[PDB]
Every structure is written in structure tokens, then in C-alpha cells.
Amino acid sequence: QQQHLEQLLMDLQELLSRMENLPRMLTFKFYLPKQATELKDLQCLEDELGPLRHVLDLDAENFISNIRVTVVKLKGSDNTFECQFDDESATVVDFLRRWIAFCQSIISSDIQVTQSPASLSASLEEIVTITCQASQDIGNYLSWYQQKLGKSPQLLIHSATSLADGVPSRFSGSRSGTQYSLKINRLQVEDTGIYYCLQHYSTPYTFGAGTKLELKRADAAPTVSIFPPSTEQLATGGASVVCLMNNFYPRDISVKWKIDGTERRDGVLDSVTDQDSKDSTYSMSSTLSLTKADYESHNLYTCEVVHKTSSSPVVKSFNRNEC
Amino acid sequence: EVQLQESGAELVRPGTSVKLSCKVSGDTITAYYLHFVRQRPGQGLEWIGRIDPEDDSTKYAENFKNKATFTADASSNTAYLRLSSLTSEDTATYFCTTVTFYYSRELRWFAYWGQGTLVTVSSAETTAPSVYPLAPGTALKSNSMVTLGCLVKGYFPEPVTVTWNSGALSSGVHTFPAVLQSGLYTLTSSVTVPSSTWSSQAVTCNVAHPASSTKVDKKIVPR
Numbered sequence: 001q002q003q004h005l006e007q008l009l010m011d012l013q014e015l016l017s018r019m020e021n022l023p024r025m026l027t028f029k030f031y032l033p034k035q036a037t038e039l040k041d042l043q044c045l046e047d048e049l050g051p052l053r054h055v056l057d058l059d060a061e062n063f064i065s066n067i068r069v070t071v072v073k074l075k076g077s078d079n080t081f082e083c084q085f086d087d088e089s090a091t092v093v094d095f096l097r098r099w100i101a102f103c104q105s106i107i108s109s110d111i112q113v114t115q116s117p118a119s120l121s122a123s124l125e126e127i128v129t130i131t132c133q134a135s136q137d138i139g140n141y142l143s144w145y146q147q148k149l150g151k152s153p154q155l156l157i158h159s160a161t162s163l164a165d166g167v168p169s170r171f172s173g174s175r176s177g178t179q180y181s182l183k184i185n186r187l188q189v190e191d192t193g194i195y196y197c198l199q200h201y202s203t204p205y206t207f208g209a210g211t212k213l214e215l216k217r218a219d220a221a222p223t224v225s226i227f228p229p230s231t232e233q234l235a236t237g238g239a240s241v242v243c244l245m246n247n248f249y250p251r252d253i254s255v256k257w258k259i260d261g262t263e264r265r266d267g268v269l270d271s272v273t274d275q276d277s278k279d280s281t282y283s284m285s286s287t288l289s290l291t292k293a294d295y296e297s298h299n300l301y302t303c304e305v306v307h308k309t310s311s312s313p314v315v316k317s318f319n320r321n322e323c
Numbered sequence: 324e325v326q327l328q329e330s331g332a333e334l335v336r337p338g339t340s341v342k343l344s345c346k347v348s349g350d351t352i353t354a355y356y357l358h359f360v361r362q363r364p365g366q367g368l369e370w371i372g373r374i375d376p377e378d379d380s381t382k383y384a385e386n387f388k389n390k391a392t393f394t395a396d397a398s399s400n401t402a403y404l405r406l407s408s409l410t411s412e413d414t415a416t417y418f419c420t421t422v423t424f425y426y427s428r429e430l431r432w433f434a435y436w437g438q439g440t441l442v443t444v445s446s447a448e449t450t451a452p453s454v455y456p457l458a459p460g461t462a463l464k465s466n467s468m469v470t471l472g473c474l475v476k477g478y479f480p481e482p483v484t485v486t487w488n489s490g491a492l493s494s495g496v497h498t499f500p501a502v503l504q505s506g507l508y509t510l511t512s513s514v515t516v517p518s519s520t521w522s523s524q525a526v527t528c529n530v531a532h533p534a535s536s537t538k539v540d541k542k543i544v545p546r
Contacts, residue, residue, distance in 0.1 A: 028424045029424055029425060029427075051424040051431075054424060085428060087427075089427075110385065143432045143433065145433065147368075150362075150416065150439075151438070151439070152418065152436040152437065152438055152439060153368065153418070153420075153433070153436050154436070155432065155433055155434050158428070158429060158431065158432045158434075159428060159431075159432070162428065162429065163429075164429050164434070165429050194367075196367060198368075198370075198432075198433065200422075200432055200433075203382045204370060204372075204382070204383075204384045205358075205370040206370065207360075207367055207368045207369065207370060208367075209367050210367040223470065223515075226460065227457040227458070227459075227460060227472065228460055229455075230455040230456050230457070230458075230546075231546070232455055232456070233453075233455045233474075233476075236453065238476070240455065240474055240476060242472065242511060244457075244470060244472060244511070246470065246497065246513070246515070269502045269504060269509055270502070271499035271501070271502055271511070272499070272500075273497050273498075273499055283497045283499070283513075285499045285511045285513075287474070287509065287511065289476075289509075318460050323460070323546075
């Protein structure tokens with residue numbers, strides 16, 4: 001036990017001794033706990049080995065790796081102490097001196113990550129938990145990110161448990177050994193989206209496969225609109241009939257095109273929006289593409305929509321012969 | 324303060340290479356490790372690799388060994404990713420993102436992300452889209468709502484940006500995901516507006532396809 005400490009102390013003494021002998025490595029910013037009085041506080045040292053590795057220039061990997069195993073042997077393995085860091089930064093030197101002082105004081109394979117669930121629907125105000133399982137001991141080197149409408153990811157929780165500046169207070173991160181949990185304390189409308197974890201313990205970095213979160217809602221009937229081909233398009237020899245179903249819930253819906261009473265399936269394109277971030281509804285677009293010749297050979301065009309909000313199919317039609 | 328900008332050919336032919344760029348503003352590039360991530364459509368984020376502008380020291384993922392090369396120039400504040408021997412599996416959005424130990428803890432791990440840049444590997448050629456108005460088949464009601472739309476048919480490759488009234492209409496808008504059929508993309512965009520706004524103000528959709536340097540604005544007129 002106290003053979004482990006003295007070994008750590010000398011390893012940290014070794015680091016400090018051979019660090020001092022240009023002002024380029026002095027720019028890196030390390031962070032310390034407010035109080036460091038017990039063995040389980042060495043978790044705070046382990047948490048800074050990432051940057052400590054980078055400053056170590058000019059296979060020192062073995063040095064940091066073996067420091068880490070010593071810390072893991074010392075800090076306890078039973079439970080996951082969350083470190084509380086001070087806002088004030090320190091050079092690599094003062095950081096090393098501080099932990100050395102603490103030690104003297106106290107003496108008296110690529111990493112896989114599994115995310116789950118893959119998808120989830122939950123109600124407003126619900127507490128939601130998403131999990132990531134790491135193939136190895138990665139400590140606090142996992143972060144959580146959000147992404148909406150295939151746009152830029154946004155950091156939510158960094159270092160397993162810390163809230164990023166900018167992020168709603170309802171997001172929080174927990175860790176139990178190799179199990180990581182993103183928790184959303186009482187789900188909000190805008191929380192519809194995809195969530196990813198990322199191991200950034202060592203190269204190569206690895207993302208979780210993602211979780212698709214959708215909001216449950218009360219039902220909502222679609223607004224259905226049908227549109228005949230524009231005169232502009234007919235001129236071009238094409239004829240697209242379009243049907244828009246707007247702001248419906250749930251997402252599960254079925255649309256048939258009928259031409260003069262008979263279902264047409266060829267030439268149809270469907271598209272659905274992502275869940276709306278303000279109303280939690282879906283919208284859908286169905287386009288039936290015909291040649292002008294084909295289009296002008298028939299009269300009645302119907303878009304027939306089945307949704308649970310109606311006991312009979314909702315129908316929208318036009319006669320070509322009028323317009 | 325900081326922004327990252329991804330830029331590169333939108334269309335590339337199988338077997339060629341592509342060169343992406345990441346322009347950093349709001350701070351020097353020497354303060355960041357610059358990391359590249361890709362996301363195939365309807366898939367998740369995949370880490371490509373990173374480069375340290377400090378020394379040009381690079382790291383690569385397993386699957387992009389011998390596909391990817393990172394390069395940099397400090398004075399230009401921009402980082403490069405070259406991707407070789409392209410196949411259809413490379414068709415994806417590429418983001419860049421940062422790691423830093425020169426600031427707070429909260430800023431270390433992928434705190435900043437580019438908007439992302441789509442790259443299509445394909446043998447097809449750049450096809451400008453045709454824009455058509457969707458206007459109501461039945462006439463105006465005074466005091467109600469009305470839904471207008473734009474068909475943007477037969478373009479390649481992705482993407483296209485639709486707006487309404489150059490940004491002034493952002494609510495009531497739905498731009499649907501494009502659908503590929505027979506080598507060409509087709510998307511619709513709609514907007515729901517008051518019955519008053521349609522007769523009094525003009526309602527227009529502005530569609531851009533930078534890949535074909537197309538710009539089309541179309542006013543929606545009753546029929």
C-alpha cells in the first residue's frame with residue numbers, strides 16, 4: 001500500500017525533476033482539486049494524465065501508463081469518486097509539485113463502446129437515462145454529445161460528469177466503473193434528437209452508435225393538401241402531383257394515390273420530416289410523378305391518407321378536367 | 324468566439340481523391356488539435372483522425388490508414404484532410420472539431436464543431452434543379468391559414484438550401500429530406516402563412532444549389 005505511494009511519489013518526483021531543465025509546454029493548463037486529503041482523491045490526478053501525456057515530449061507512454069495503474073491500485077476500485085476541480089489553472093510544474101506535496105502529505109487494443117438504447121420514445125417531464133458501456137477501464141475520458149437535423153454535434157457533458165457551459169442544467173452525467181450514464185432530468189420538447197458518447201481515453205477515439213430520442217405527444221390529425229402540376233412543369237413535359245400532410249402525431253401513417261379510382265404505386269416518392277423541436281409533430285410529403293401525356297389521359301387524382309386520428313381515410317382530390 | 328469552417332468539392336468521381344479544408348477563426352490554430360469526423364447518411368459519427376498543427380504529428384483511425392492524410396499551414400489558419408481511392412462508401416458529411424489544453428476543462432473535448440460539408444462520390448454529373456410552385460387548387464378565404472410549397476425536382480448532387488422570403492419566413496416552414504430516384508434528387512419545401520399575408524405581401528422561395536452554382540427565387544401565385 002505505502003510501497004505504492006512512495007513509488008508514485010518517486011514517479012512524480014521523477015516527472016518534476018526531468019520537466020525542469022522551453023516556455024511552450026508551460027501553456028498547457030492543468031486543474032487541481034480544492035482539497036486533497038485522502039487516497040480516493042488521487043482520482044483527480046488520474047483525470048489529468050491525458051494532458052500530462054501530451055506535454056511529455058522529447059515512448060514515455062509507459063511512464064504515464066504505469067503511473068495510472070499505480071493510482072488505480074491506490075485510489076480504491078470499489079466506488080467512483082467524482083473530483084471537484086478548482087477553476088484556477090496551473091502549469092505542468094505547479095501541478096506536479098502539488099501532487100508530490102499531496103503524496104508526502106498522505107504518506108503519514110482499441111477501445112470499443114456500446115451505447116443503449118438505440119432508440120427511445122418518452123413523454124414530457126420524464127426522466128431519461130442513456131447508457132454507454134466501455135470494453136475497458138477508461139476512467140473519466142468519455143463525453144456526451146447531441147445532434148439535431150444532421151447539423152453540428154454539440155458537447156453536453158465532458159469528462160463523464162461535467163456539464164458543458166451553454167448546456168441546460170437538466171443534462172447530467174454519471175459513471176459507475178465502466179458504465180456511463182447520460183441523464184435528462186425531466187425531458188423537454190426541444191430534447192428530440194440524437195445523442196452520442198465518445199471515448200477519448202486513447203487513440204483511436206470511438207463514438208457510441210447513438211441513441212435516437214423522440215418525444216411522445218397527444219395525437220394530432222394531419223393537415224392534408226393536394227396540389228396539381230404547375231403549368232410551368234407541364235410545359236416541360238412533366239407532371240408532379242404533390243400531397244402534403246402536416247403536423248401529425250404519431251409518425252405512423254399511410255398514403256395511397258388513386259387515379260380515377262385505381263391505385264398507382266409507381267412514380268411515388270415519400271419524405272418525412274424529423275420530429276419538430278417545438279410541437280413534437282411530423283410532416284410528410286408524397287409526390288406522384290407522371291409524364292404530361294399520362295397525366296392528361298386521366299381525370300380524378302386522389303391522395304388518400306390513413307392515420308389513427310380518423311376512423312375513415314382522409315381524402316383530398318382534384319379533377320384535371322376543371323382545374 | 325471560435326468558428327471552424329469545412330469546405331471542399333461537393334462531387335468527386337470514384338477512384339479520385341478529395342481535399343477538405345478546415346478554416347479556424349476566433350483563435351490561432353496552434354492552440355488546437357484538429358480532428359476530422361465523418362457521418363455517412365443515416366449513420367453515426369466516425370472519427371477519422373487528427374493533426375497537431377504544432378508539429379504536424381498525425382493520428383489515424385484503423386479504417387482510414389492509407390486513405391487519409393492530414394496537412395496544415397499555420398499562417399493560413401487552416402487544416403487539410405486528403406482522402407484517396409474514393410468509393411461510394413465515402414459519401415458522407417465531414418466535420419472538423421477541436422481538442423485543447425490551453426483553456427478550461429469544459430473546452431477540451433470537441434467543444435467546437437464546423438457546420439459540416441457533404442461530399443458525394445459518384446459517376447453522375449452536376450445537374451441543376453427545376454423549381455416549380457405548389458399553389459392552392461381552390462381560392463382564397465379571408466381570415467384563415469394557407470399552405471404553399473416548392474417542388475425542387477431532378478438535381479444532383481446534394482445539397483440544396485431552401486428559404487422563404489430570404490429568411491423572413493422561418494416559422495411555418497418544413498423542408499423535407501431529398502429523395503434519390505433514378506440518379507436525381509427531389510425535395511419539397513412548404514410554408515404555412517395567414518390568408519392576409521398571401522394577398523398583401525409576396526411569398527417567395529429561394530433555392531440554391533452551390534454545386535451547380537444555381538440560384539432560383541420563385542414567387543408563388545394563385546391558380
